[PDB]
Amino acid sequence: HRKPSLLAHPGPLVKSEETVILQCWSDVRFQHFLLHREGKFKDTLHLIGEHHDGVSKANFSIGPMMQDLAGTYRCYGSVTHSPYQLSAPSDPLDIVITGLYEKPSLSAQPGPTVLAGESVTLSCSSRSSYDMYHLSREGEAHERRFSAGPKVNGTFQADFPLGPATHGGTYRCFGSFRDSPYEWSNSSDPLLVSVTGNP
Amino acid sequence: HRKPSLLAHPGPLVKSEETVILQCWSDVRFQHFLLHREGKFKDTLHLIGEHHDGVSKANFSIGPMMQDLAGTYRCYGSVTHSPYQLSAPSDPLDIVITGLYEKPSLSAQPGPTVLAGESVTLSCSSRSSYDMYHLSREGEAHERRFSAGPKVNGTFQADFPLGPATHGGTYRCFGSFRDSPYEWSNSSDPLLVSVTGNP
């Protein structure tokens, strides 16, 4: 009696007003699903699942984004002859808000034009007391978080060792506080890491 | 006076007899390079760099692979009017041998056919006392290591949380001991992780 899947289109990071979709589905005939949200505004939803060949689905849309809506979501599914026998919970998915506070500074190192093979360490910071820092490589699968190294010259940074330079890329950085893990700051200005090639 | 780059074609993992190449280069006019190997058979090499437009280069070939040749390499470069004024050392690159001992067992979980969005945790093990475990996603950029969880039912495994299932893929697993970090066992039989898609 497996659990459903919880996706997020466009993606987990959402700017204010910006409204997002959380497609919960399974290859089963789940009659209807529940979308629970853990955290601040602990709330629950319900949707009768559509049934495009081989797959049931409930596309919940989290309306105009706000701080009270970002948090951990988990999805459930139940079938006709027992809609109160809930399925196993789907892997928790975090939906966050972006642009709440000042954007950080994202420096590269060695520099932003290393040659193929050279290891790179993107490292961002701020004068603000951010407790975390998130690295988003333009589109690339997912993000990477990191605990800040508080106070040094007023700044608080975190270094992200990307390892030897694979391909180029555009990375952005976000800062957040422990307080509310789903509330993030603006996006650091985009950094183009350019990997000079070899024969 | 930057350092050169050290690549490895085909790649860092080398089976016995199999002979590999370590292309060290820079966009500078390095007259000649040095290839030092740290570890077991501490040895050093020298090569006058060729000069294909915009780039000098020394392609050292580590002959018939054996345990005494695998280890940490670092590359240096010096220019004509001072070939004894060495450059900064290039990022250490590890060259390893594969197939020294029994291959491990690479199980998937939930299973090897999760749906898009579902998180996966490849987890391999062995009856042998491996202290480490390395995950190689067929071609995918690089590897990921992990400390084993010794003795449980005779076995010693390590779980690799791949996170939510991006794309499918073929993963292999290797086991090694602390003793010689460059000596690895055979490759676990290939695992095809198939990510069922969504609308």
UniProtKB/Swiss-Prot annotation, chains A, B:
It is a single-pass type I membrane protein. Residues 17-82, 117-180 form the Ig-like C2-type domain. GO terms for biological process: immune response; immune response-regulating signaling pathway. Glycans are attached at residues 59, 153, 186. One of its GO terms (cellular component) is plasma membrane. Keywords: Cell membrane, Disulfide bond, Glycoprotein, Immunoglobulin domain, Membrane, Receptor, Repeat, Signal, Transmembrane, Transmembrane helix. GO terms for molecular function: antigen binding; identical protein binding; signaling receptor activity. Interacts with ARRB2. This is Killer cell immunoglobulin-like receptor 2DL3. It comes from Homo sapiens.
